[PDB]
Amino acid sequence: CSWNDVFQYETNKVTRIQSVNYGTIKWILHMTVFSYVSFALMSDKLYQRKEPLISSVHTKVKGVAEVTENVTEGGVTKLVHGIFDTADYTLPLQGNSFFVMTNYLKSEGQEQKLCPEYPSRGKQCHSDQGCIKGWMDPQSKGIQTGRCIPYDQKRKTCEIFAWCPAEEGKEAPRPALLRSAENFTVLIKNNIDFPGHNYTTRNILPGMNISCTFHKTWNPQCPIFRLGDIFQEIGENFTEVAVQGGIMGIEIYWDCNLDSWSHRCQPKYSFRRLDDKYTNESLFPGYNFRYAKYYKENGMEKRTLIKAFGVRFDILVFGTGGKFDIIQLVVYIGSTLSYFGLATVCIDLIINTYASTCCRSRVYPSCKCCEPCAVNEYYYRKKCEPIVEPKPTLKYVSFVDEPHIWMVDQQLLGKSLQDVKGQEVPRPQTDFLELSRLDSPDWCQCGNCLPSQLPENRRALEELCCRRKPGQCITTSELFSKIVLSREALQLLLLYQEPLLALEGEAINSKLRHCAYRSYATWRFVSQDMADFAILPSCCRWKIRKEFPKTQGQYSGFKYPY
Amino acid sequence: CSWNDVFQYETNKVTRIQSVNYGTIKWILHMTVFSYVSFALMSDKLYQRKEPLISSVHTKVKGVAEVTENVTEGGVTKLVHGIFDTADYTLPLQGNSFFVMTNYLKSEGQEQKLCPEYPSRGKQCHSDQGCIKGWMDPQSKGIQTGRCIPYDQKRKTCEIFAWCPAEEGKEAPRPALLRSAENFTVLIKNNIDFPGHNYTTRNILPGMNISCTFHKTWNPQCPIFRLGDIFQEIGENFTEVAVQGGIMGIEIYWDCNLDSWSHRCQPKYSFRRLDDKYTNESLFPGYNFRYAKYYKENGMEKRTLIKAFGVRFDILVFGTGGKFDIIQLVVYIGSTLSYFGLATVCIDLIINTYASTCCRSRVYPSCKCCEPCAVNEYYYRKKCEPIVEPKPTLKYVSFVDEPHIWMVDQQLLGKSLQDVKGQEVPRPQTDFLELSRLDSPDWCQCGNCLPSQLPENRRALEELCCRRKPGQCITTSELFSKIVLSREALQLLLLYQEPLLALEGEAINSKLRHCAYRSYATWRFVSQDMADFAILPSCCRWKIRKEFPKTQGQYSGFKYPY
Amino acid sequence: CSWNDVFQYETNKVTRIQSVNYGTIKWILHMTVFSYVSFALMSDKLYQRKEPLISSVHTKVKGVAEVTENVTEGGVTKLVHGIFDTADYTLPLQGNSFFVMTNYLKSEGQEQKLCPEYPSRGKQCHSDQGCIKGWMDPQSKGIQTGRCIPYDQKRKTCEIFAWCPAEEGKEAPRPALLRSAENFTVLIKNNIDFPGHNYTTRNILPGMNISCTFHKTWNPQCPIFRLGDIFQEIGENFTEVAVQGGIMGIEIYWDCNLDSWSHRCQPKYSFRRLDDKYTNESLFPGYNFRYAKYYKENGMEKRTLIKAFGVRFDILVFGTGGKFDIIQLVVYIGSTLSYFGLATVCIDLIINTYASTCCRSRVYPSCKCCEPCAVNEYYYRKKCEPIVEPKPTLKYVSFVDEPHIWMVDQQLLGKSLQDVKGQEVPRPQTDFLELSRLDSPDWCQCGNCLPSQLPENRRALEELCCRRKPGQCITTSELFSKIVLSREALQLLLLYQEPLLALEGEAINSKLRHCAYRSYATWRFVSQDMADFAILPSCCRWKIRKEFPKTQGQYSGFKYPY
């Protein structure tokens, strides 16, 4: 590795075509790609740096309801009138989610003692020996005891040490008690912060009347909601959900750009139902949970249990805030360049397809409209230089009677040449700038061939004739003796390379002979690549040998050039 | 398709330039790109596979406070001394967030009954008929009834069935009761898990003194905090926030690499305020909520209601853990390759710009410093081979008096040729390796042109002259008769392709005549691509025709080659 | 900017190689890349648009337990038998997480008053002057007062205004009270929604027996779990965790494709422990908290405090739903194209490596197996066209005695030429299609050189000789006088370009002389690029000058061509 090898810059080589069709196609594709990427950049705001948000939600529910119920306690039933305020139908969860009671089922006066279990469907027992001591299972309000007692006249149930009077499995009461909760109100206060952009805002703005209510079109940016409207917008019925509660969800979409020329950051409110739309025959249809209020009277602990059915609103906050940024632009321009190669790849594909040489056969005479596209063939000739790898089996042969050249890339295995065939190939056209300057063996149709002198193993390659059919030989013409066998022209060609060589040298003869071989190939096999592997016939070879003979040893043959 | 077509590998063709400037530019750009990508890989740790974390947080607040307040109950007021412990100013939320009370406002002795409403601002009523029965609205503590009663001497308000004595709307008491909460302490225990890397850890380490407090510099990794310092770090005031509570937020950043040579995983604590910086005249400035304690005495249900103002800390855990991975390296090396094309594209752009041929006119003589950059023009000649598509309208004309060639890609519409002009173009230089080998019509300035014999529609194309101005003809020279009209040289050129054709053939004459046309084009239009579409003048054409005449039919004209 | 310069389409230029090895390598690499991308597309389902989920969880725990404990109140101890039901060991959290009590430690009969503090380890005090009034610290149940009192006979402690009888710091009681909670049951109801795909579903399906239990293999899709099995699957022990509680975690993985031909969406349940694996000597091992139950009797407020140790389950729901989408396919096909260049880059690298020209020296004779790979050199000759930039220092020299050409890109600084050396370079081969056509100064070894006439500063460049060693001159041959000094051939070469120039012109001589210089270069420096910068010796120069002399002024020298 030398210093001169470090400064070498390597550059691709191209060809330029002046055509209206390809130019129009190229510019159309470039313009539409530019339009697409610009539209995407302007729509999606890819020039902006986007960042997620940090949210904080606070909720306040308001409303009152009345209830009238035949309540039981100590075996005494009586109609009681009660009121439910905010502190009674809500629990202090203090988060994004909040709860609202719509129906309840309570049992009061409970105290820890022995009592019979309420006989449910299939829990009857009229045998004191059937029960088992200290056995617990789900759907059981207590621990079982070996004894037995009657729950009522003509009723027999197992004893249990638990809270008594034990709660009895009841379905939810329909119509609900707190169906009036369809008229309650909510207030949702959301503060959102983009830290990276250093922006903070809130859904509430100055001047809003607090006696407002959210409507989809009338008053959209009023954070106060009505619990009936949330179900009305979707199509659900609150009076049916109240009996067996169900989960609801609110979504607050924040999408805005923190640019001075376009600064609108407002929340969009949406609603969704997360629970399954349950019906009769469903398995687990309702949302419910139990909770107790403890107390004591006359030195004895007691509780009041409440199974509460009610909705649950799961607030969901998601968004992204964008602001102008310069590096994202550069990142996008870096990506567009790969897309910009469509015209190049498409037009190259069109050329390579239309230069197949099969279209001239059938599709062109059939259609009769795509004729001038044959022009593309010319482009291929000015774009693709086809070659072939050199190998010892590579040979070329030309016959004067035929117009084309025959390549041979196969071993002989003793067979005589010109009896084996190979893929045809056409000869190239001569550079006209220089052209303007001006008895016998069985395998010879020429009559003038000679047998080979090489060994019996390698001589079959030398078996050849100038003409494949009989009638004429190449060496009988005059151009042959003018070009090849002219000693003066060959001496001139040798002087053109080495002008100071001596013409009286003894070993000069062979030198001339070598040139004569090339002087044949260039006549027939024009290309130097095709001429290095060309093989002369026997007649021309032995003519040249008799004009330029060797005496010391036997003649050699086709030596591999490398 | 063919088998020989499947093994064909297609390779791009390039040119190699030995220049110090381009080499230095190339290597500079390569080195700086390498430096940038290596710096990015080392800084961002892109060689690592990253994974998010799974967190579990637990909190414990500790501290005590005293309160002295004139409490009311049953119309009896008296000064009472009370204590607030951990179980009193907190609620069992059991999550990431937790709550602390800083101010309260309570009403005790409530019972469900009829009572008057407390007259708020604008809720006075001195008319029994004005009220409506069975009406509910927000900001109302109960259901209204048609009756009316006096709340006090000289006071008249509406009756309601609700909890009595009904709570009266008051502002938050200032100074706050639990301002002492600025000295309470917190303990935060966070456990994090990276499942994919299988790494579990915790913020607490062995040996930390439990009698520590968080400081930004003194003792950073002490998870115990002080509620006053959290506000003091930001610049807030706890005494002003205690009156109307506000939300606070703690952030715990985990960023660490699970590599054996670099293993430091420690949390970073940060603070932020999620609520708005509220002040006077704001609408909804305070965090608060209501909760109730139920009980009963002498067989009657009662409750104690508490409107609580306090802060709410929202703990936020975000992080990512990285560990060494081999495939990410490969993915990054795969991406660098597209970036590495900067030198190529930039230098090619420089060449294409400096080879515009306009710089030689104005900018070079003006600046007088970018002269040697004209060298780049040569590179263009060795890089871009320009061509033109063949079409029937395509024609080339050359006049001996002018030095350049005239292209014509436009229809004639009956106009005589050489009266219409087209874009100039220079002739290519001859391959010197071969060059070293050695009355009249109105539209002719040459005096030797002849009229055309083609039809009247298509003959105007043949109208031409050798010279555009008068004075001389081409056929008067000697090189003309040496090259074209020499029967021997043309016969030799025919033998060079088909050495066995007979010179006695009657149809050979026309053959020779065809060659003569090419022998003119190659003399003037050197390139074969240009020579195939060249057009001879009339004088030379008819000279060639008289030397090689036809008798059977009329002569044809310029046939399209393909 | 011309119009014709807008329709110019630029196309890369290539060379096509016919080789079995490179074709096989190309197709192998293409097929394996195709296989890889297809396998990735089928495995990762990249043909689908994926979307995250929106989840809603609801829990219900069931089970009962009994406790027998020597409970204390008012200095009276007695054995008490209690029961714990669903409302007694759970708290209404109503979220993803839920809590279960496994151990408790309670203190009842508390009332706000003055009492002594329980003497802990190191909190003794036998001196009334040591205490301080109005001092609060953590680990203290109340505010300290200056007075002192005895907690018991032979015990002295500080007085405090707080809840009395004050709770005493105790360790967790082992064995736990609610170890029976290993046999409780849970029910988890999860509803998921994919909005974009518009698909709602639930883990529960019709027909499941509600008397089921989750098993990893037997009954996987039974959402009922047993709290002992959750620990048993991992390897933990519930009885050891129940004393000092710890956090557990459930994970629900939804991975499914919403395609009609493949529609299976079922949850996978997994378990994990989020808390640390704690043992003896650890610092903060347990999850616990405190909560109180308030009441009043005989007109006096009271509370019962409970320190609860228990587990906390943190349900975690993550997943992604996929459905078929057409644009993602196009996006993937767009990405594969960059990958497809492997064969091209690899084979070009192989060619550029094997064409280094160093392999022929050492590695080939050593290995003796990679000989035919030398063939690749030929490809390089058909691919890379090496050139050199023109500059005023660039010169070329050739000596007939040597076979190669010497490049010189260095300033002389007054030194005589042919005494300075430069990098060698071989001469290119002649186009054989045209080749078939047919006293003295100190620094001259030729004997025929002349001194220079240029100024003393610039004449050293002209100092040169044809032969580097003595014995022969070039101008003594016959080819020299046949090519260069032949007035007729030069006149013909001039007529070949400008056929109408007059041979009687006085200024024609110099013209011929100029041509003679070129007629030397093409003889020795075959390329036109190398010939434009070639420099003649003195002997040939002055021979040409004597055959074509100038009389008016002194002869100039080598002028820069551009």
Ligand SMILES: Nc1ncnc2c1ncn2[C@@H]1O[C@H](COP(=O)(O)OP(=O)(O)OP(=O)(O)O)[C@@H](O)[C@H]1O
């Ligand atoms: N769901 C709600 N529906 C209607 N009005 C509400 C609602 N929630 C709060 N408000 C009213 O809007 C205003 C803002 O409530 P905010 O909590 O900020 O003040 P407040 O004095 O603490 O409320 P409160 O009436 O409970 O004392 C109050 O006048 C309040 O009466």
Ligand SMILES: Nc1ncnc2c1ncn2[C@@H]1O[C@H](COP(=O)(O)OP(=O)(O)OP(=O)(O)O)[C@@H](O)[C@H]1O
């Ligand atoms: N905010 C806090 N400030 C100061 N010390 C604390 C705080 N929280 C907990 N601790 C102390 O740090 C240690 C760890 O608390 P941990 O809950 O693990 O044990 P503990 O004995 O159950 O707590 P305790 O009985 O005091 O309620 C305890 O000694 C505890 O007193």
Ligand SMILES: Nc1ncnc2c1ncn2[C@@H]1O[C@H](COP(=O)(O)OP(=O)(O)OP(=O)(O)O)[C@@H](O)[C@H]1O
């Ligand atoms: N952990 C659980 N273990 C066993 N069974 C349960 C469990 N949770 C609920 N169930 C049973 O499965 C069914 C579904 O419970 P669901 O809440 O939907 O109805 P429910 O009548 O309100 O339940 P219950 O009144 O017994 O509390 C019920 O029969 C219920 O008894």
Ligand SMILES: *[C@@H]1O[C@H](CO)[C@@H](O[C@@H]2O[C@H](CO)[C@@H](O)[C@H](O)[C@H]2NC(C)=O)[C@H](O)[C@H]1NC(C)=O
């Ligand atoms: C919405 O569903 C509720 C059920 O909760 C419907 O309530 C019934 O309405 C019909 C009127 O068609 C009355 O005849 C019934 O008396 C109502 N049920 C009860 C229990 O009172 C309600 O009708 C539905 N919405 C509308 C607009 O009808």
Ligand SMILES: *[C@@H]1O[C@H](CO)[C@@H](O[C@@H]2O[C@H](CO)[C@@H](O)[C@H](O)[C@H]2NC(C)=O)[C@H](O)[C@H]1NC(C)=O
């Ligand atoms: C922080 O804000 C509080 C208000 O809550 C300030 O409290 C007052 O401090 C001034 C001293 O400048 C006293 O004169 C007032 O008596 C304080 N207010 C009350 C109600 O007592 C406090 O001053 C502020 N911080 C500092 C350092 O002054």
Ligand SMILES: *[C@@H]1O[C@H](CO)[C@@H](O[C@@H]2O[C@H](CO)[C@@H](O)[C@H](O)[C@H]2NC(C)=O)[C@H](O)[C@H]1NC(C)=O
């Ligand atoms: C799981 O851990 C528990 C500890 O909570 C072990 O309980 C002990 O089990 C051994 C049996 O090897 C008994 O001798 C002890 O009496 C048990 N401890 C108590 C307090 O009763 C339990 O053994 C462990 N699991 C197994 C399978 O042994």
Ligand SMILES: Nc1nc2c(ncn2[C@@H]2O[C@H](COP(=O)(O)OP(=O)(O)O)[C@@H](O)[C@H]2O)c(=O)[nH]1
């Ligand atoms: N293309 C081609 N080259 C040949 C042929 N015959 C000989 N050559 C070359 O000519 C040389 C051998 O010629 P030859 O008559 O045997 O003389 P020798 O070397 O003294 O035996 C070698 O350099 C061969 O490469 C032929 O038939 N075709």
Ligand SMILES: Nc1nc2c(ncn2[C@@H]2O[C@H](COP(=O)(O)OP(=O)(O)O)[C@@H](O)[C@H]2O)c(=O)[nH]1
């Ligand atoms: N480039 C060029 N080719 C010509 C011109 N004239 C004739 N040719 C070719 O010469 C042939 C016609 O020659 P022509 O004298 O008409 O003989 P004809 O074919 O017997 O009528 C055709 O192959 C033409 O393509 C010309 O003016 N310029």
Ligand SMILES: Nc1nc2c(ncn2[C@@H]2O[C@H](COP(=O)(O)OP(=O)(O)O)[C@@H](O)[C@H]2O)c(=O)[nH]1
């Ligand atoms: N490559 C090369 N070109 C030369 C050389 N000498 C002269 N030229 C060219 O020939 C012209 C000068 O020839 P010269 O004998 O000085 O005649 P002058 O122009 O009347 O002075 C210029 O155009 C030179 O570029 C030489 O030695 N080598």
Ligand SMILES: *C(=O)CCCCCCCCCCCCCCC
């Ligand atoms: C001549 O030899 C016949 C041409 C053979 C080349 C065939 C090229 C086929 C190209 C098809 C590509 C279509 C575009 C598909 C994009 C997804």
Ligand SMILES: *C(=O)CCCCCCCCCCCCCCC
């Ligand atoms: C000769 O014909 C004049 C040259 C015309 C080509 C002009 C090319 C302009 C290229 C500008 C590119 C600047 C870099 C922009 C990167 C974002």
Ligand SMILES: *C(=O)CCCCCCCCCCCCCCC
């Ligand atoms: C001839 O002058 C010698 C050839 C010099 C070229 C050396 C090219 C080395 C290429 C190494 C690339 C290996 C693959 C690495 C992939 C990560």
Ligand SMILES: *[C@@H]1O[C@H](CO)[C@@H](O)[C@H](O)[C@H]1NC(C)=O
């Ligand atoms: C605000 O709107 C409400 C409801 O629409 C109505 O009372 C009135 O238009 C406004 N009230 C006040 C107080 O501004």
Ligand SMILES: *[C@@H]1O[C@H](CO)[C@@H](O)[C@H](O)[C@H]1NC(C)=O
């Ligand atoms: C630990 O630090 C604390 C507070 O700084 C101090 O009491 C002492 O330096 C250490 N205490 C113990 C018990 O190690």
Ligand SMILES: *[C@@H]1O[C@H](CO)[C@@H](O)[C@H](O)[C@H]1NC(C)=O
């Ligand atoms: C369902 O399964 C349970 C438990 O395996 C068992 O009682 C029985 O196989 C089925 N019971 C019912 C009621 O379908």
Ligand SMILES: [Zn+2]
């Ligand atoms: Zn023969």
